[PDB]
Design a protein around this ligand. Structure first.
Ligand code: RET
Ligand code: LFA
Ligand code: LFA
Ligand code: LFA
Ligand code: LFA
Ligand code: LFA
Ligand code: LFA
Ligand code: LFA
Ligand code: LFA
Ligand code: LFA
Ligand code: LFA
Ligand code: LFA
Ligand code: LFA
Ligand code: LFA
Ligand code: LFA
Ligand code: NA
Length: 270
């Protein structure tokens, strides 16, 4: 009974350990993660004036998302490098008992904060038609919260009880699907009576949103996408997971933000 190695990162780090390659790669990707968020922060601050007053709440929410993301992805970065330490004897990086162990808490918290704000911010750029601001807002915020919370629970049982890991994953996925359903409704109403240039950008937003957000359940499941014998159940699934999460974060926060800025600007022409 391995006791030291909560989550799969730890488990691997206690038993098999991490190649130089895996350790350093994961380090660097996480660093890139928070690097980009800091660049994002400056971008959204610096360009706030490029959109009409009435859209600026979207730029604001982007900046604030960037602040949270910088701070917590930085935390996550340092958490990674501190949780694992080199052993000359075996020539790999192993879970360090004198460190704090790898904690998903940082990222998941980032999600809890950022998800409501990301979902909200589009509603300051598009107009609804038949739907009510408050209804969409409440739907987003609730489902957003539930999705992240259920997932956070699930994540605990990842080593100890896969069956629960997945059932919580599934529950979370149900909330995810509702968010997709609502966001699609929003984008369609947002398209009504704007210029075709604006409808084009909204189309791209939908696709970015759909893809980027779907990366998350991917990275969650990543280590088990090959069986318990198979190839991803390894420091490789760890590498993959942290790569996909990072890609997702950048796309769903920074790029999403950029596109909305671009949408606002076209609405700022007709
Ligand atoms: C900026 C961060 C964002 C937009 C995070 C989004 C996170 C999710 C959409 C997570 C979704 C999950 C599932 C749908 C199933 C597995 C558990 C989660 C939380 C990873
Ligand atoms: C017309 C749209 C212009 C796109 C500008 C995008 C700027 C985003 C800045 C954040 C990404 C910078 C990456 C640096 C990582 C270090
Ligand atoms: C007029 C707006 C100027 C855009 C500068 C973008 C800065 C990117 C930060 C890295
Ligand atoms: C408006 C165009 C601004 C481009 C900003 C490029 C971001 C560079 C990131 C590296 C710092
Ligand atoms: C553009 C209108 C700004 C109103 C702020 C509403 C956001 C409150 C979030 C709580
Ligand atoms: C809503 C933006 C305020 C920042 C919240 C993130 C808290 C930073 C935590 C740093 C690591 C501890
Ligand atoms: C304005 C939208 C609300 C975002 C606040 C962050 C949610 C609190 C989680 C702690
Ligand atoms: C629903 C997600 C709840 C996130 C709360 C976890 C906060 C942990 C902060 C980082 C861990 C430091 C120990
Ligand atoms: C939605 C998950 C239903 C249970 C799947 C069975 C996986 C357990 C593997 C042993
Ligand atoms: C989408 C419907 C899911 C039904 C199950 C709800 C589970 C509640 C989660 C408890 C959180 C504490
Ligand atoms: C036509 C403009 C397309 C915008 C999508 C940009 C997404 C970057 C993909 C990485
Ligand atoms: C057909 C135009 C597609 C542009 C939308 C952006 C592409 C999705 C990027 C996925 C993020 C990883
Ligand atoms: C249906 C939306 C398409 C997104 C596919 C991305 C999910 C791949 C899972 C990561 C490996
Ligand atoms: C909502 C669940 C999304 C699962 C996508 C990952 C499946 C990848 C197929 C291999
Ligand atoms: C004409 C359409 C232009 C919109 C494209 C938006 C591209 C978003 C740029 C952010 C990508 C940052 C990734 C940095 C990784 C190095
Ligand atoms: Na170390």
């Amino acid at each position: 009974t391995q006791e030291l190695g909560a989550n799969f990162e730890n488990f691997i780090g206690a038993t098999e350990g991490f190649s130089e390659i895996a350790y350093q790669f994961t380090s660097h990707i996480l660093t890139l993660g928070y690097a980009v968020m800091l660049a994002g922060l400056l971008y959204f601050i610096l360009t706030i004036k490029n959109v009409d007053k009435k859209f600026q709440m979207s730029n604001i929410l982007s900046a604030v998302v960037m602040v949270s993301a910088f701070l917590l992805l930085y935390a996550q970065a340092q958490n990674w490098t501190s949780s694992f330490t080199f052993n000359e004897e075996v020539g790999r990086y192993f879970l360090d008992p004198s460190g704090d162990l790898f904690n998903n808490g940082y990222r998941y918290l980032n999600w809890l904060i950022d998800v409501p704000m990301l979902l909200f911010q589009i509603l300051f750029v598009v107009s609804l038609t038949t739907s009510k601001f408050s209804s969409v807002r409440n739907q987003f915020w609730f489902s957003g919260a539930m999705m992240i919370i259920t997932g956070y629970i699930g994540q605990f049982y990842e080593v100890s009880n896969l069956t629960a890991f997945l059932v919580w994953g599934a529950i979370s996925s149900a909330f995810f699907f509702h968010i997709l359903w609502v966001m699609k409704k929003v984008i369609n109403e947002g398209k009504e009576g704007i210029s075709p240039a604006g409808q084009k950008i909204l189309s791209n937003i939908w696709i970015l949103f759909l893809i980027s957000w779907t990366l998350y359940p991917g990275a969650y499941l990543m280590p088990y996408l090959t069986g318990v014998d198979g190839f991803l159940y390894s420091e490789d699934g760890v590498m993959a997971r942290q790569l996909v999460y990072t890609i997702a974060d950048v796309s769903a926060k920074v790029i999403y933000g950029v596109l909305l800025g671009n949408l606002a600007i076209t609405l700022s022409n007709k």
